Amino acid sequence: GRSLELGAADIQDLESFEAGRGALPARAYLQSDAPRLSLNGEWQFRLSPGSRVAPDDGWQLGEALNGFESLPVPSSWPMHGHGAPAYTNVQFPFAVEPPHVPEANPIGDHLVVFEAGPEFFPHALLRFDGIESAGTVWLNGVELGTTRGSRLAHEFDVSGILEQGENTLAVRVAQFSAASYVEDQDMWWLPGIFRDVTLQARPAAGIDDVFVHAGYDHITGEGILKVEASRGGQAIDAVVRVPELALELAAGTEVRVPAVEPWSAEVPKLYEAAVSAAGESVALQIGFRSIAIEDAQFKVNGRRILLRGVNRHEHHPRLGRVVPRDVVEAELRLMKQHNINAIRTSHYPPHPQFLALADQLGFYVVLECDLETHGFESAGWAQNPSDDPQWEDALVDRMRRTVERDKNHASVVMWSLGNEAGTGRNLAAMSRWTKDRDPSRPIHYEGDWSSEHVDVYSRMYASQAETALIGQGIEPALNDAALDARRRAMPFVLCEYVHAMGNGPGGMSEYQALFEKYPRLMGGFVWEWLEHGITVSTADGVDHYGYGGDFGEEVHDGNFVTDGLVDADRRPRPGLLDFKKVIEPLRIDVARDWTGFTLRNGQDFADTSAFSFRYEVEADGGALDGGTVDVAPVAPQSETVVELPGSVAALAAGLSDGRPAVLTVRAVLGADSAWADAGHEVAWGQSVREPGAPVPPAPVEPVQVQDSELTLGPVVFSRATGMPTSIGGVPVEKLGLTLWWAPTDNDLGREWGGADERPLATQWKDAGLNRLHTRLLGISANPGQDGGETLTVRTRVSAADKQYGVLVDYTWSTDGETVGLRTQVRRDGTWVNRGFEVEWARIGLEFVLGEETELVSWFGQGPHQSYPDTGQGARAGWFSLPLAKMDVEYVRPQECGARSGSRSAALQLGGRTLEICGDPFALTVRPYSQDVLDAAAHRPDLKADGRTYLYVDHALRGVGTAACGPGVLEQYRLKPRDADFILTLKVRS
Amino acid sequence: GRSLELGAADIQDLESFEAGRGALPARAYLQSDAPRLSLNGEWQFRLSPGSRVAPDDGWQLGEALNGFESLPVPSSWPMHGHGAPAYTNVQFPFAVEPPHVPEANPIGDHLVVFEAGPEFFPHALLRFDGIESAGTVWLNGVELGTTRGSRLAHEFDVSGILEQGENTLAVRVAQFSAASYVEDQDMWWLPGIFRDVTLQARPAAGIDDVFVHAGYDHITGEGILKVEASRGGQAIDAVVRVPELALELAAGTEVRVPAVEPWSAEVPKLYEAAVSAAGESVALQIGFRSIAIEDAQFKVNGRRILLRGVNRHEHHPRLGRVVPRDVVEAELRLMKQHNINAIRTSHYPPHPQFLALADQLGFYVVLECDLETHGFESAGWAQNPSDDPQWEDALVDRMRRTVERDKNHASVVMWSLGNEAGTGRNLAAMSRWTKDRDPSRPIHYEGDWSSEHVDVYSRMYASQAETALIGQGIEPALNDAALDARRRAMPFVLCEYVHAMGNGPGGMSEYQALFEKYPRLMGGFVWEWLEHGITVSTADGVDHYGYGGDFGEEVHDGNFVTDGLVDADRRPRPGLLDFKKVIEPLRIDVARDWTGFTLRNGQDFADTSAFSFRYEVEADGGALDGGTVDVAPVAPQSETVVELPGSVAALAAGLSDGRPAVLTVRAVLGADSAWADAGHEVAWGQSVREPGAPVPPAPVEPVQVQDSELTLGPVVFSRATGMPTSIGGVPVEKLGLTLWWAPTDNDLGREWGGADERPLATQWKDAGLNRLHTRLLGISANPGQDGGETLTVRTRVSAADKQYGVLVDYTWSTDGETVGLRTQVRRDGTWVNRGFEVEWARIGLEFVLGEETELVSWFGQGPHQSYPDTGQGARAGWFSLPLAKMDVEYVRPQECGARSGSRSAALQLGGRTLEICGDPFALTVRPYSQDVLDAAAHRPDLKADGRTYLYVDHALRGVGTAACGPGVLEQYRLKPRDADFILTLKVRS
Numbered sequence A, B: 001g002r003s004l005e006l007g008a009a010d011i012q013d014l015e016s017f018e019a020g021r022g023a024l025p026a027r028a029y030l031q032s033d034a035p036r037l038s039l040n041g042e043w044q045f046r047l048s049p050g051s052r053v054a055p056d057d058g059w060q061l062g063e064a065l066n067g068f069e070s071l072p073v074p075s076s077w078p079m080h081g082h083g084a085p086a087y088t089n090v091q092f093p094f095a096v097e098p099p100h101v102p103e104a105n106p107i108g109d110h111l112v113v114f115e116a117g118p119e120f121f122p123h124a125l126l127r128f129d130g131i132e133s134a135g136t137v138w139l140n141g142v143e144l145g146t147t148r149g150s151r152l153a154h155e156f157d158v159s160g161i162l163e164q165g166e167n168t169l170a171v172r173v174a175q176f177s178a179a180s181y182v183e184d185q186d187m188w189w190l191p192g193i194f195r196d197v198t199l200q201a202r203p204a205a206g207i208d209d210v211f212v213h214a215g216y217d218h219i220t221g222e223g224i225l226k227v228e229a230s231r232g233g234q235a236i237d238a239v240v241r242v243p244e245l246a247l248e249l250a251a252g253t254e255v256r257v258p259a260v261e262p263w264s265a266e267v268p269k270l271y272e273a274a275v276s277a278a279g280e281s282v283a284l285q286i287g288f289r290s291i292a293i294e295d296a297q298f299k300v301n302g303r304r305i306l307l308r309g310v311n312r313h314e315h316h317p318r319l320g321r322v323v324p325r326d327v328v329e330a331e332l333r334l335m336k337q338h339n340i341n342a343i344r345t346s347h348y349p350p351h352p353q354f355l356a357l358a359d360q361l362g363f364y365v366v367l368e369c370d371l372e373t374h375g376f377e378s379a380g381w382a383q384n385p386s387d388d389p390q391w392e393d394a395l396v397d398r399m400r401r402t403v404e405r406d407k408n409h410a411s412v413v414m415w416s417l418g419n420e421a422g423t424g425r426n427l428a429a430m431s432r433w434t435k436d437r438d439p440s441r442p443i444h445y446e447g448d449w450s451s452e453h454v455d456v457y458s459r460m461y462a463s464q465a466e467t468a469l470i471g472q473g474i475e476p477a478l479n480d481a482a483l484d485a486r487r488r489a490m491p492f493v494l495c496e497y498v499h500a501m502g503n504g505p506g507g508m509s510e511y512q513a514l515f516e517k518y519p520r521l522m523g524g525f526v527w528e529w530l531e532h533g534i535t536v537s538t539a540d541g542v543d544h545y546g547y548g549g550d551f552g553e554e555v556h557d558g559n560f561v562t563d564g565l566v567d568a569d570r571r572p573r574p575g576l577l578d579f580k581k582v583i584e585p586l587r588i589d590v591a592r593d594w595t596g597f598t599l600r601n602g603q604d605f606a607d608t609s610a611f612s613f614r615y616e617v618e619a620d621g622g623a624l625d626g627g628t629v630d631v632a633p634v635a636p637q638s639e640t641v642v643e644l645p646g647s648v649a650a651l652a653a654g655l656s657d658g659r660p661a662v663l664t665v666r667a668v669l670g671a672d673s674a675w676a677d678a679g680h681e682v683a684w685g686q687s688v689r690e691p692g693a694p695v696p697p698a699p700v701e702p703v704q705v706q707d708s709e710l711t712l713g714p715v716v717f718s719r720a721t722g723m724p725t726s727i728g729g730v731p732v733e734k735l736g737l738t739l740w741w742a743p744t745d746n747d748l749g750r751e752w753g754g755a756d757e758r759p760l761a762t763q764w765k766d767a768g769l770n771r772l773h774t775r776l777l778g779i780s781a782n783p784g785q786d787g788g789e790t791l792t793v794r795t796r797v798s799a800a801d802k803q804y805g806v807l808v809d810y811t812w813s814t815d816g817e818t819v820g821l822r823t824q825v826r827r828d829g830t831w832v833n834r835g836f837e838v839e840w841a842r843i844g845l846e847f848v849l850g851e852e853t854e855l856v857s858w859f860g861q862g863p864h865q866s867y868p869d870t871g872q873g874a875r876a877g878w879f880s881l882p883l884a885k886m887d888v889e890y891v892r893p894q895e896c897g898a899r900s901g902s903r904s905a906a907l908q909l910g911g912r913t914l915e916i917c918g919d920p921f922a923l924t925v926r927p928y929s930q931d932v933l934d935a936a937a938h939r940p941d942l943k944a945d946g947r948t949y950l951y952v953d954h955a956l957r958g959v960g961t962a963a964c965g966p967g968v969l970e971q972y973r974l975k976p977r978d979a980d981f982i983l984t985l986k987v988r989s
């Protein structure tokens, strides 16, 4: 019997089910006049590969340091060259055997020397706001305690250890600990001290914790205020002063303020208040709100509200978990600018400073505890911590610390027990505690569908259909009659829906229609706000985002970090633009006769008084008229009809039959707000006078036959191919039918149900839809009129080893000036492969041109892209973009850039402009081919070859959200069918 | 109404269901004294991308050629830079719509000018032996006709077109034609004139075709001879002279020769004969044989024979379909050297010159017609030519031309209608014709399992089990009572089995046991003889074989061309070495007491008289004794017992208890034969005296504990890891358990049946078996004896996101000189993933050493590799190889190089030699890691890193033949279980 392994005692600590030891009781984050010293700055940093290899050179004392270097704190140290980021989603990065930790466990030693003034005597504390995932803290070689709960705050008492003058603070941080088993969220695994380390003095007769109770009686219009204040866990005498309400009360007593302005996301009214004791005073912002669940509805201040929300992770493309305050203010303002009123802190408490901003700019906030045991799902939740009693104290500590920190803020309207932790005893323990401490807020958890220990029914990525059932209260009952009776009486919320990976999300409209129609639906939260992209510079110094698997990770999920509405640098993806329109607070139905418009106010509290209503009339290359209309304030959930100036309606009948004109009624801010400047666009509506169907040119031109070529009008053909080689001088290198997209991220994912287990992208490859070949059948010339000949090229399209195909015929005609192309498409054989019917991505034509396009113009829906289930934010008008701005810079290159519902388009090539008219078609123009687009793993992989790839699609497919949740809806799917369309071509040289 | 496409008439020809027009009636390939002129040499060659683009510049006349260049003929023109090779297997390279051809159809114009002497007047013909796939032939601007049937010979009459003096011959060749639909074999698609173009004069009163009927009466010992000779399709008077049999008869009459020596693969007795007419005489080699199907047995000359065969494609690594005669002679001799007696010409007639060689060196030849419509299987054989009456004449022409060419040869014992053409009317038409023309030979076809139109029951890749049933005649009956009665009375043959892709094939022994035990089993043909590798030179001029998909092919099958017993350059893969032993014609069971051996003659005709029997006794580094034993000739299918010299048996009892000695009795050729030199090894047998289990060293050495390291005997450890860092001075960089191979080609293929659809390679990746991590549990030191301490390192092995694992413990001990390692392995949890139990590839240890190994020695089975279901040819002995010769150069790098059944091994590193002893283990040594081996797509991807990767496996897995056909057999599979083994380590410096 003998023992000889190194670092045993260190690991036993890492493998404890105990919460952080030594730390003071959990309290709220308060703004205090008590002297503070921030220890943020250059610290000394040493990295070790394991705990068994971690040096014991008494480094904690700060002198004779071996191998240390300066590292900024707070920070995520992989972001600074020390190691590399790693990313997994459903999977753990280590062997699952709780609570044991792997041998490859990066240990980062942190050290800093600071001097402490007399202000921090006799009593003071150290406050860590976040250490991932386990930390041991020494002050002048004395162990203070350990920290567990990476996104939770720990405070240690340094009274009697802190010396006057220079002090030495040493923190040992381990990446993986037993706590890693309960923090399995969807993100890069980035260890380190990533939040503020703070030294704060604790005066005698000071305030340790404050609990604010600000309620609103919507009937009597009275505020109900009562402020608890305590020191050392016991209630104390303190004075509460609210200047604006002109009152002065003692803590612990409950008074009713006669008239208060209630708080909401629409009107974030806050009252300045201070809680004063002898030793210190605390500064608070008080918002009067009351939350009730009544008649299966989630109500705030008496009225049902609609959550238009997103899921906000904390991420930066260069700093790790560190999100600079200016960056936080920026994104919150951006959310407000796009009609967002709710946030779910997924899947952990955010930076303490976040809560204040959510109070100030109006947001309904779902504050989620730092708990996710998603990696145990793989094995049927065997060894799940949520049900293991060994984990009870540790998990309850996580809930307590979460609730305690942010209880005072009005924005927090719900506590959430965590994400995807399964079901268990501990979850029930966590809920039970929270209902006892803070009854003012309902409780949210998605994992337990029985909804036994929560106040709202919550699901993620439920189908539009399923939601429609739940909204009507006719969803299938639970086995338990008692439990079903409770859940059927709960409001419903989608804590995650419309996955926004890559091109998408689609189907956002079908969800919103249900949100507006059924009171039981609270609305919900989009997944997610931002991409977790990380900036990388190449050998030639191109920088682009990188995703999972790009940093050498043994185990990864590729590009799933990229599912955001904005990129890592907070630049809006087209999805956010569409989202803004879907959840807009006002609906404007412009009448067809342009006499007036119908306006409905979709807000729950405010009226249409902060808005200014403008109208615009666009036609050709000029705004024909503009102005402002006077709209009497409209009550919330009410609608009126506003008549437009007679001048507008007069211009309608005034314009010629068949030329396009667009009437736009826009709701903009009357004056500056905290989150936007005046004139900012909130909601809009349109009525469009569309051009009639174009007329095919006179077939009065004959076909001139030479030895190897044909000529008709300005179009030169090839007698071998049957395809044009030149139109009005523009080099046509290729023309063919396309049935296939470059697979989006939605296509790469398996679809919800169905006998076909294969991702739609795979279905296409097996069907050979990406490798189509054309066989020429014959070229006819047929009489038109007055010597005119109409050329007809008959072809068949198919792929290798396939017996099915499609017959397409191109009949050309021209009056000598304008070229008329007609395409007929017929199915040859049954399109089934591997026992499943093959779906198409499009019915369109690919034009490859030998000259670059300098600039693209069109009339239809823009500026950004449009697909059948998307492009809601794309409005009618005239748009002109450089070729470079046509594309969309998704992290992983895929199908994007299609402008649906086009009527006409113009491509300028050198000195020539190519006009394309016809029936509604979808426009796409690229500097590179699809084979290039598909193959590309990153943006740099895309090199232009000097050609112009023009795409004109008759019918398109929906993009859906198949990456996670519902795929393409039925009405948006594209199955094999026979089709036709006419085009109008012309070249102005 | 009008038509304007180019090259319409050319394509209509390509799309005809008609056979070659203009060609003379099919006849046999005869050696004639009639004057011949070979036109092989430099020709002029022009390539065009399509038939619509193919120039009509009257190039056929040979002057004012534009864009021509010199190209050798015969040749495959992609092998000469003109285009590139393309490879598919089951799939067609173009859209399936018979008989239409793609637009991308390479057209190669061939042209040559030759002068013709007066000998070729007044009558002569042009003979093309092979044009792939369609050819049009002009002579001096006159169209002779077209050729259909790429591996079939066409002859055109040039009488009255051939001028005296200079003539100009022009051939237009198209790669794809309607005939491509019926030539869908497993190979590179290589067009061109790839066989001899020949000019032959046809004298008056000459012989056009000869049919030889040479039968053998095994009862009376009489030859039955009758030779038909004809001119212009009508019988003529000719004189047959057979010098050796001293007879002279007139053609058309049937005589019985009193005493003839019969022909067989074992005794290829041929009689010289000449058929003389006035104008010319024909030289023939006559072999007397008779084929009968009787009592469900395939009989030749009265006796049941055993087909030990292979499938021979015609391929060269540099020339395409062109296989030089010296290369053909070479491989045929190589086959004979490895006990092969049968060949299946897959899947087309071979070069005309092949048939003669198969007569001379003894081979049973299955001659297969050029027909495969395998690409229609994809769509349930819709539009299958085999059943389409439009194809009848074309398909019957293929059978006629095939039979007619090679009817005279004795080696051809069966006509085969083709491969994988499905079922149809035309197949029945082909059989019906063949039975009428040549009843002397049975008919083979695999596609129609009902076996309605054939003479033998034939299957491919049927399981060992299924074969065992068929052998006993108890296979499940057919729906048709009448048909079942016929098929149940047929002999059975596997036209393709034991797929030899990559490492393998395994399970060859279990098949052969059935072949020997059941008379109904004819034996069968291995797939296949050679790899279709193609030589490629890199930027630094490394040359290596390339496979499908490596030449830019839109559609491919990767490395499936690589499934041979030899590489493209006819270098034996280990599979051939194993195969030679499995099908050896003699079995030698050496008695245990070394007194004698049992010898059985497995041949059907010959006796043991051409052999010399040698014996050898090896022990340590010396052959102790050698000699020759006198064995009375043993009759075929009979066995005798031969006593060894008393000196041998005396040496057995003479040697110490526990030292190894190997007795080898070997059958070698007494004198030179046509295919090998005297002394060549045919069959062998062994009896082995194995060393006793090694004894664990005295645990008398204590553990010396320092700060960061441990020391026990000559082994230095690391206290952090628990792994040795040094043994006797050799740097040990790593030591760990392995459960995973680098997936072979068999592992990459789906397995036959089972709920698990996943290839075994994929099963491993999902299970995380390739990414194992170890967690240290503890290091103990326990008392041994006399101050001795036995170190024990306890660890656990697992992978990320997995809850199952394995507990392995390493207990070390040493007497100061020899190190004793013991490994205990225990399963922790159930090894199931995705609902399926996880199989292991091995139970072994990986040693990574910081020094290169110069040379590896061992005692066990060698020289080549050994796996549970393979290594039959690996014999017992002492082997020593350079590290470079340990590896096996498979085209795609995979698991290989394991020497199973090892007893001891020695690795020399610089000046140190490392000895490893113990229980039977499998040895593998590599210059690179497994991660390198797996990732490598080609041989060049393998770069040594200066380390030595040593593998010692307790238990191994079978390789099977899962790439196509049966996977690993039950007794060879490796499932999770608890195991142990002891090792003996020692370093001699």
Ligand code: NA
Residues within 6 Å of the ligand: A186, A560, A561, A563
């Ligand atoms: Na995600």
Ligand code: NA
Residues within 6 Å of the ligand: B186, B560, B561, B563
């Ligand atoms: Na093959």
